[PDB]
Amino acid sequence: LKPNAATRDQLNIIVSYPPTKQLTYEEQDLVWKFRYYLTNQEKALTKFLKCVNWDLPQEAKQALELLGKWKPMDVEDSLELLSSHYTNPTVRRYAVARLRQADDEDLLMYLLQLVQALKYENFDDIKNGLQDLCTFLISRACKNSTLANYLYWYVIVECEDQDTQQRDPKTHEMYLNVMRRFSQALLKGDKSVRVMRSLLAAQQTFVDRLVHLMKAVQRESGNRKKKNERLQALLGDNEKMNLSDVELIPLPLEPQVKIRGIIPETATLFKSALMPAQLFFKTEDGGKYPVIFKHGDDLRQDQLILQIISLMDKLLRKENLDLKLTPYKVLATSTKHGFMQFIQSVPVAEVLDTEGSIQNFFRKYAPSENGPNGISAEVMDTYVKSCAGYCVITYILGVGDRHLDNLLLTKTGKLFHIDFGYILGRDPKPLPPPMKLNKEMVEGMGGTQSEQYQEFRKQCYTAFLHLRRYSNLILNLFSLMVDANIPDIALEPDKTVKKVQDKFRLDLSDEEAVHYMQSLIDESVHAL
Numbered sequence: 001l002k003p004n005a006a007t008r009d010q011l012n013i014i015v016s017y018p019p020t021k022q023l024t025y026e027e028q029d030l031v032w033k034f035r036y037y038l039t040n041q042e043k044a045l046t047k048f049l050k051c052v053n054w055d056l057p058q059e060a061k062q063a064l065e066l067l068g069k070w071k072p073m074d075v076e077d078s079l080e081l082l083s084s085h086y087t088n089p090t091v092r093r094y095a096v097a098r099l100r101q102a103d104d105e106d107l108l109m110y111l112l113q114l115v116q117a118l119k120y121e122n123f124d125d126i127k128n129g130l131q132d133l134c135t136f137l138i139s140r141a142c143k144n145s146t147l148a149n150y151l152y153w154y155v156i157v158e159c160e161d162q163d164t165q166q167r168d169p170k171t172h173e174m175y176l177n178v179m180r181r182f183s184q185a186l187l188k189g190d191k192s193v194r195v196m197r198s199l200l201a202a203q204q205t206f207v208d209r210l211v212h213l214m215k216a217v218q219r220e221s222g223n224r225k226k227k228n229e230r231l232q233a234l235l236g237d238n239e240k241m242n243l244s245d246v247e248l249i250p251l252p253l254e255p256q257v258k259i260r261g262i263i264p265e266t267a268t269l270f271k272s273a274l275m276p277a278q279l280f281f282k283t284e285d286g287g288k289y290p291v292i293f294k295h296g297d298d299l300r301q302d303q304l305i306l307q308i309i310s311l312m313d314k315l316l317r318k319e320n321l322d323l324k325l326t327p328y329k330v331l332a333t334s335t336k337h338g339f340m341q342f343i344q345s346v347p348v349a350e351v352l353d354t355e356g357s358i359q360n361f362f363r364k365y366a367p368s369e370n371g372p373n374g375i376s377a378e379v380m381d382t383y384v385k386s387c388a389g390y391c392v393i394t395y396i397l398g399v400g401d402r403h404l405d406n407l408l409l410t411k412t413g414k415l416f417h418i419d420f421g422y423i424l425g426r427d428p429k430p431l432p433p434p435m436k437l438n439k440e441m442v443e444g445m446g447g448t449q450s451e452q453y454q455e456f457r458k459q460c461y462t463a464f465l466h467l468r469r470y471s472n473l474i475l476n477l478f479s480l481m482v483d484a485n486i487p488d489i490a491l492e493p494d495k496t497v498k499k500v501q502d503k504f505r506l507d508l509s510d511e512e513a514v515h516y517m518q519s520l521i522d523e524s525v526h527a528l
């Protein structure tokens, strides 16, 4: 009923394990032995549930009894209970009950993964509904238009996934039923929610017309100039395409922004194989919102990565660390098209081509006599911070294919990464470095001889230690994606979480982790 110091230190280590680390039989025996002692530690609950044999009715019954008496786990920790590991309905309900306590802002941060988690729910319960996870998500969406917006588009992407339809038709049918349940709940509610239903329908019609227009532009066989002219001609013709002027609708990419149409004369096609469009949306308040609209292209890996980057940024900010990151919005409107929030910027490759150096760039657009190397101290501070943030973040996420056209710069000093087609250690070339810096970025802050290089290192340490403390949440979110139709995940689903977990070096104390991170940055820089 009570363990000794040696046992306590063992149980404490077990309780410290990452969420998807498998417990040995001995550890399962130990956690079970002292389950009553552990009811006062909310962090031990997930470990106890992992040691239960849910196929033995008497054991499951006792486990559920202890679940009711356990000090409730932190809301975030409940995401683990919605993974593929748990089929016991009372466990999965308990998770939903904890998630009910999260505010709308936090729930939005997990919503992408929770939609994936529907794959592990009871498909008959979802169908027969025409709180479990489906009921909960719909309930929250009917009370928050932003949640409704993302729930709708997340689920409609799943419904149009032809891979799921062929490979797992029952899961495809479930997602159809979720959409039916969602539509059912919206129509049933009050005027505010019924209005939401009409606005979602209006969004879908707008995207449909945009998709049709993109296809019409590409039926053309002319050069890029002729295609831009066609794109602008079809956009300016509101009567046929109805995209120049439409009733106010929430922008699916960022529904807080209401749009009235697309500005026809400024729409152009990117000079790239897939020829995505740059479009400027007319916002409700007379402004402009530029986006990239990709067609014939799967944005879902980018969508996940930008969502995780947004979360990591919010976590850092919550720890009072604003590293000036650029988590631009990404929203798939289907498996073959979607939106990206366009940030005015210049690729580092272009900076080098035209200015020769990042320092030359900053001196042209942010000069200051007595600033570091003649550059505005504010701009340099922003550069150092964002370099540090993306260094740690892209390291944890194993982002590959890091050429200088995928590193973008702003005249305010912000550096950020784009194009996340290679993640989790994948790379076009072999033997990719665990940490991927490049000479030009270090040179941008004045080289290793600058004070800025040490402040860069210090910010990496601080961000690394902060994100380490949220490893349970970050790993839990990735555990809910292991069965997702994401290329670099589906390529090795059973090793996906471990590949992120390893980056945290949770075997190392904070002090050792700082030394490790220092060694990593210096060694990466030494290689140049």
Ligand SMILES: CC(C)[C@@H]1CNC(=O)c2cc(N3CCOC[C@H]3C)nn21
Pocket (backbone or CB within 6 Å): 270, 272, 276, 292, 302, 328, 340, 341, 342, 343, 344, 345, 408, 418, 419, 420
């Ligand atoms: C040719 C483009 C599609 C190119 C390549 N792939 C991408 O995913 C991507 C993201 C991106 N950024 C532009 C600046 O604003 C932020 C973000 C939208 N540029 N690109």
